[PDB]
JSON list of C-alpha atoms in Angstrom, two decimals:
[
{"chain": "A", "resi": 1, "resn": "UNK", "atom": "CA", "xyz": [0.00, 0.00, 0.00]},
{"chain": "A", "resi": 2, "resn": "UNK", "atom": "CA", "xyz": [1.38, 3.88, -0.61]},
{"chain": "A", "resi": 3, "resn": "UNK", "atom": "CA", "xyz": [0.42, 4.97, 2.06]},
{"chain": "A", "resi": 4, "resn": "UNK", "atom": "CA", "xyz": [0.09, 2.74, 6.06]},
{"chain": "A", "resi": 5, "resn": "UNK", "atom": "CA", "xyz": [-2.52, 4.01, 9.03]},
{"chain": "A", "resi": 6, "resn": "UNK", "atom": "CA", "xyz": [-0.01, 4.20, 12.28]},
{"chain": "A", "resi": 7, "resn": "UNK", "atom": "CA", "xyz": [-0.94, 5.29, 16.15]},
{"chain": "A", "resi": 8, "resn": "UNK", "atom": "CA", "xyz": [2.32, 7.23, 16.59]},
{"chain": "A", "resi": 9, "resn": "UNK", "atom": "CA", "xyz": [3.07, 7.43, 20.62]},
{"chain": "A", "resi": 10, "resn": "UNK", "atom": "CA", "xyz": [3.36, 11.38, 21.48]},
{"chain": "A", "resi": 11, "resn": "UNK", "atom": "CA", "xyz": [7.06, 11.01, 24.14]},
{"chain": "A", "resi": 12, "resn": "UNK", "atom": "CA", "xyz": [7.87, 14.14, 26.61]},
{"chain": "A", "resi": 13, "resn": "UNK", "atom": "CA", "xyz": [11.08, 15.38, 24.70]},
{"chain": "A", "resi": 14, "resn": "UNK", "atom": "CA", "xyz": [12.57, 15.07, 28.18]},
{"chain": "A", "resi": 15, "resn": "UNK", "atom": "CA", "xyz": [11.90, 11.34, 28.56]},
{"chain": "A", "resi": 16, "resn": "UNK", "atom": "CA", "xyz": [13.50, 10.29, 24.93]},
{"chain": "A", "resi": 17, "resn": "UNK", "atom": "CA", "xyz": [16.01, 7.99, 25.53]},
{"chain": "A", "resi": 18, "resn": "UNK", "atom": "CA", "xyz": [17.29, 7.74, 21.83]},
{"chain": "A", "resi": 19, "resn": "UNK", "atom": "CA", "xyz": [17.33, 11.23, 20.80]},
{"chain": "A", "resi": 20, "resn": "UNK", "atom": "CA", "xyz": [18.12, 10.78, 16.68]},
{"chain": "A", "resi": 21, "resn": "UNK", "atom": "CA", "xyz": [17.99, 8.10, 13.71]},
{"chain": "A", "resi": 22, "resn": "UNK", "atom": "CA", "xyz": [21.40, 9.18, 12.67]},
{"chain": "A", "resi": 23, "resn": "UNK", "atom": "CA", "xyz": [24.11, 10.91, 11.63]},
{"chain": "A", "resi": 24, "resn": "UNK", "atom": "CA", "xyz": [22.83, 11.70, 7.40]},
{"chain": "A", "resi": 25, "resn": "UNK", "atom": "CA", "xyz": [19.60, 12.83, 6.12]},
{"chain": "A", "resi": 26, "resn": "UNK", "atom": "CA", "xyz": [20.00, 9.65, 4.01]},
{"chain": "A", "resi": 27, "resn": "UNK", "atom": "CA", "xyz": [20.08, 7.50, 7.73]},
{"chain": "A", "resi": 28, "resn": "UNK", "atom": "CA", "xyz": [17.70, 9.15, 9.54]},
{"chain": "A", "resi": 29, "resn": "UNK", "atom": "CA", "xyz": [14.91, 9.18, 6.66]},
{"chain": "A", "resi": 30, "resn": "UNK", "atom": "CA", "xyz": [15.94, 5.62, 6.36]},
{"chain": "A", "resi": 31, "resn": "UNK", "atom": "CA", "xyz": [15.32, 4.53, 10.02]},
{"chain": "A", "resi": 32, "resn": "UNK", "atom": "CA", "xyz": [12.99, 6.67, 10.47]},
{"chain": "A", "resi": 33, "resn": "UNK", "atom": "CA", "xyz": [10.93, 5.00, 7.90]},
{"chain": "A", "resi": 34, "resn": "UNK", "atom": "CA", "xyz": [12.03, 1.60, 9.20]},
{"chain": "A", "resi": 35, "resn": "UNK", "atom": "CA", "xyz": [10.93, 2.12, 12.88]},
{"chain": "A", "resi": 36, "resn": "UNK", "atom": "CA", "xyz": [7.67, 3.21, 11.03]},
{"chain": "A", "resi": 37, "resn": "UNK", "atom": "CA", "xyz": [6.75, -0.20, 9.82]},
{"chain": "A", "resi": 38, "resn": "UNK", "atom": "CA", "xyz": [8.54, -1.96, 12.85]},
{"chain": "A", "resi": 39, "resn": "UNK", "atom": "CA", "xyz": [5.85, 0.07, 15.12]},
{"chain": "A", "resi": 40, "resn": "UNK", "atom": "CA", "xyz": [9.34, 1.75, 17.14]},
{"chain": "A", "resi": 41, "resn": "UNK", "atom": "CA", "xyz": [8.77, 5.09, 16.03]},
{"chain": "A", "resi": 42, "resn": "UNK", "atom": "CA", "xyz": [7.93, 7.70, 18.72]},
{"chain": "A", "resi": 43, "resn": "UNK", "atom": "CA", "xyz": [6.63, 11.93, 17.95]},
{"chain": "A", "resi": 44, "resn": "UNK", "atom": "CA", "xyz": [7.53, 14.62, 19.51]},
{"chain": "A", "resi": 45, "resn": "UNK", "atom": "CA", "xyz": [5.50, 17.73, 19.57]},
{"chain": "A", "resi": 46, "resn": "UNK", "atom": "CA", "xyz": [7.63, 20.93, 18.70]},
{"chain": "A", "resi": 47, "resn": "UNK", "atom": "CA", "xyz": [7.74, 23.80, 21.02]},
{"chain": "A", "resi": 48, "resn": "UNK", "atom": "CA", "xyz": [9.98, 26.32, 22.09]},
{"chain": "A", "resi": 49, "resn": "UNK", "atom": "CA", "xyz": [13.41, 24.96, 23.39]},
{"chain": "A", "resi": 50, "resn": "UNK", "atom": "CA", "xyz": [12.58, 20.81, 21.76]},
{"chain": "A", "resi": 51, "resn": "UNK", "atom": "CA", "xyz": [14.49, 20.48, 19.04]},
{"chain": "A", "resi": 52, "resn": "UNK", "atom": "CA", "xyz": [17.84, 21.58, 20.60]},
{"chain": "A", "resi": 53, "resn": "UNK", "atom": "CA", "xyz": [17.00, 18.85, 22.88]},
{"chain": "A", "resi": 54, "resn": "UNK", "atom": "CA", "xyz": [17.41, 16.23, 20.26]},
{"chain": "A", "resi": 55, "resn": "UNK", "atom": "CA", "xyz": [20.12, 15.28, 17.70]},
{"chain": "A", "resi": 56, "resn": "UNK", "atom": "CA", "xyz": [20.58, 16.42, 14.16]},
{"chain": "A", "resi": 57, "resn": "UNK", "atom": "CA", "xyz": [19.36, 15.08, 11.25]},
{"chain": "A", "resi": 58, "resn": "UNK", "atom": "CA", "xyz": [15.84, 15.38, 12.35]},
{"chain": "A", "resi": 59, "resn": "UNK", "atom": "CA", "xyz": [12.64, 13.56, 10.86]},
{"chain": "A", "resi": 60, "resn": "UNK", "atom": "CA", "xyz": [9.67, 15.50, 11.01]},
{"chain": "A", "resi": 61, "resn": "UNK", "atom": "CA", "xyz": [6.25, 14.33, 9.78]},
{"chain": "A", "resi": 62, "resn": "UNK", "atom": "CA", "xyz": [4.44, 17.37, 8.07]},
{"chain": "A", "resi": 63, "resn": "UNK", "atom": "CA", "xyz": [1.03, 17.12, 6.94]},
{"chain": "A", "resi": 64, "resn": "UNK", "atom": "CA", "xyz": [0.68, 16.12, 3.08]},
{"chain": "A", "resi": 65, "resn": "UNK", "atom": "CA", "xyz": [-3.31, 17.47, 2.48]},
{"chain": "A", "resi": 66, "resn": "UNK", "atom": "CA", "xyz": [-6.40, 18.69, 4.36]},
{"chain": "A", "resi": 67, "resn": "UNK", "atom": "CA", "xyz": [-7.96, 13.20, 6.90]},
{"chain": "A", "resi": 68, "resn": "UNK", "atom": "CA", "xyz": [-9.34, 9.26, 6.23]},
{"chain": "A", "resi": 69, "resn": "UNK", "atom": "CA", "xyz": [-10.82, 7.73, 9.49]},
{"chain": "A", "resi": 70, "resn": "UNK", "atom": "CA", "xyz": [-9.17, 10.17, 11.37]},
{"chain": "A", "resi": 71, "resn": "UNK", "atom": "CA", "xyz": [-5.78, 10.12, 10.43]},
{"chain": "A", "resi": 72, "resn": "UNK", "atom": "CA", "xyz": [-3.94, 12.32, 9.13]},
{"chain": "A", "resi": 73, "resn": "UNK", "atom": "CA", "xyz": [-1.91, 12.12, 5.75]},
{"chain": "A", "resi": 74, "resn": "UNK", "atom": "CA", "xyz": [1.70, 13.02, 6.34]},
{"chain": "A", "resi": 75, "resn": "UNK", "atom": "CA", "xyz": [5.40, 12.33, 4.41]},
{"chain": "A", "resi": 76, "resn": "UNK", "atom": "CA", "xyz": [8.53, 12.99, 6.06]},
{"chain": "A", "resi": 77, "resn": "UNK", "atom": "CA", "xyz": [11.36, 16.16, 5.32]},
{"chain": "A", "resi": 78, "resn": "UNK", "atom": "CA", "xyz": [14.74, 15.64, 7.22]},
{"chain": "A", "resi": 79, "resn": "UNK", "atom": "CA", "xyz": [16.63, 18.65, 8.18]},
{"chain": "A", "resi": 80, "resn": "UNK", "atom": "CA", "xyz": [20.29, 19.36, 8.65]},
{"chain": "A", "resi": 81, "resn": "UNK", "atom": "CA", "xyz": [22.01, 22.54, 9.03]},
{"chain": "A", "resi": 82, "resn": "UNK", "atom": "CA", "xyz": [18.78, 24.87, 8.47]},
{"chain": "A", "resi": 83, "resn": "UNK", "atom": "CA", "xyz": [18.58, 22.91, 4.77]},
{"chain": "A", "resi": 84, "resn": "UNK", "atom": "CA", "xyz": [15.21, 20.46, 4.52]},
{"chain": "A", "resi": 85, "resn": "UNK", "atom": "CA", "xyz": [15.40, 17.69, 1.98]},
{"chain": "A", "resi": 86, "resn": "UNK", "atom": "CA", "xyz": [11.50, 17.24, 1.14]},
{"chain": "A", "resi": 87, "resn": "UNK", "atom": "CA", "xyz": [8.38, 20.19, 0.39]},
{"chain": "A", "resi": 88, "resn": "UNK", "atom": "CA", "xyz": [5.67, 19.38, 2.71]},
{"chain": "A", "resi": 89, "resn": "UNK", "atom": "CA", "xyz": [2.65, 21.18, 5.31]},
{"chain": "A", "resi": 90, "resn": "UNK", "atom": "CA", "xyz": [2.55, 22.21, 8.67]},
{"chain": "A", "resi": 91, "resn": "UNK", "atom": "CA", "xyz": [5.04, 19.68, 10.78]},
{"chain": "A", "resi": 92, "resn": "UNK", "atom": "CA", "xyz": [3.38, 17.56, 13.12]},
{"chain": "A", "resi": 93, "resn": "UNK", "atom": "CA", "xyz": [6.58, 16.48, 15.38]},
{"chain": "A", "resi": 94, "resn": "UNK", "atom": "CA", "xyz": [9.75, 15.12, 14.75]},
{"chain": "A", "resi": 95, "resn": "UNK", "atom": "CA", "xyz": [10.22, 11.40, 14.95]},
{"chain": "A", "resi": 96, "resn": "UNK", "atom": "CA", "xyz": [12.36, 9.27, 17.23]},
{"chain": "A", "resi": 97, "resn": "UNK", "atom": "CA", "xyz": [12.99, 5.62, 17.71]},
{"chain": "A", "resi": 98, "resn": "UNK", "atom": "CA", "xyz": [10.51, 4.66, 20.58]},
{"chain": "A", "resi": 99, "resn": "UNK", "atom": "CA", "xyz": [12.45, 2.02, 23.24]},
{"chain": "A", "resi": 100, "resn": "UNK", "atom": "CA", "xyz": [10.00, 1.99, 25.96]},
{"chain": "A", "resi": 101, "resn": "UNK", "atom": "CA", "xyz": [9.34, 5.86, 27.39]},
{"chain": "A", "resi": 102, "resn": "UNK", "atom": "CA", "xyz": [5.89, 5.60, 28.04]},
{"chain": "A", "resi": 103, "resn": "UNK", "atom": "CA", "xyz": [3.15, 7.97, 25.82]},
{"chain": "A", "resi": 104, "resn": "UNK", "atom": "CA", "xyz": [1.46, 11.36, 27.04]},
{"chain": "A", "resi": 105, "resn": "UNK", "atom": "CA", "xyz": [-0.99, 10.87, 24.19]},
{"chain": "A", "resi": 106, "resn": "UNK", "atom": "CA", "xyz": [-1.44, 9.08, 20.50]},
{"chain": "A", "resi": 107, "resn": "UNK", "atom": "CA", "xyz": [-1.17, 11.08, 16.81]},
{"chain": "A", "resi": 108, "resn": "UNK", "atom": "CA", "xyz": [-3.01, 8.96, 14.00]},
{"chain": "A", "resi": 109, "resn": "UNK", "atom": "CA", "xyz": [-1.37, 9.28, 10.74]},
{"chain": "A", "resi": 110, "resn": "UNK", "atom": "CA", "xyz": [-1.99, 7.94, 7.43]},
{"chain": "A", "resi": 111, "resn": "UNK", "atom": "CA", "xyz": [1.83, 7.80, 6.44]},
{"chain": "A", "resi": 112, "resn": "UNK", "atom": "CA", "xyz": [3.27, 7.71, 2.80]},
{"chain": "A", "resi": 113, "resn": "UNK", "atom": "CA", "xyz": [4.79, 5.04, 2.36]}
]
């Protein structure tokens, strides 16, 4: 299928244990998109003093159009630098591997896949 419905666990930026998919936009899309299917992809929600918190390359999921069964279409853009490597919406958080850290809440996506 193109595109995969996923219950993405919402993590305190605070709690993350695992802070990054890598070290190249090339790695982190590519884990990041691995941990997607392998349901070990957590989202943080980006506010004021997060993503300084957590390591370059980020992942973000941005919203791809304006939402079947509740879920939200999204793609991912990884940044480096100040320099994104995808066009997409309004970001919905940045991913990280999820190891454990328990959830404040759940984001339903409908990821492209």
């Amino acid at each position: 299928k193109t595109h995969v419905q996923l219950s993405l666990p919402v993590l305190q930026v605070r709690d993350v244990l695992v802070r990054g998919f890598g070290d190249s936009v090339e790695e982190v899309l590519s884990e990041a998109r691995q941990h997607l299917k392998d349901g070990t992809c957590g989202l943080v929600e980006v506010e004021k003093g997060v993503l300084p918190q957590l390591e370059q390359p980020y992942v973000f999921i941005k919203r791809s159009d304006a939402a079947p069964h509740g879920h939200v279409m999204v793609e991912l853009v990884a940044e480096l630098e100040g320099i994104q490597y995808g066009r997409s919406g309004e970001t919905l958080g940045v991913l990280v591997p999820h190891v454990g850290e328990i959830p404040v809440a759940y984001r339903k996506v409908l990821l492209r896949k």
